UniProtKB/Swiss-Prot annotation:
GO terms for cellular component: actin cytoskeleton; aggresome; Cajal body; cytoplasm; nucleoplasm; nucleus. GO terms for molecular function: filamin binding. Residues 1-78 form the sHSP domain. The chain holds residues 80 to 157 of 170 of the full protein. GO terms for biological process: heart development; regulation of heart contraction; response to unfolded protein. Disulfide bonds: none annotated. It is found in: Cytoplasm; Nucleus; Nucleus, Cajal body. This is Heat shock protein beta-7. Keywords: Chaperone, Cytoplasm, Nucleus, Stress response.
Amino acid sequence: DAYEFAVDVRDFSPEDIIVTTSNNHIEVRAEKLAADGTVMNTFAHKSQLPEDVDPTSVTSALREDGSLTIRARRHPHT
């Protein structure tokens, strides 16, 4: 089984969407610029992964409905 959550990136461009991970957190972040290029819109979704989720297995899939799907596999205890 894997661990996944969704992010709302509907009004942003793929270039500005960024996924930053580390030992126990994932950080999705985007920002939409105007014609000139001034930031008119930005957010930052910073998650706190469980201890069994491997942060190096994080795949990301943008879909046509404007939702970003973060996905990481977990090695549960046995």
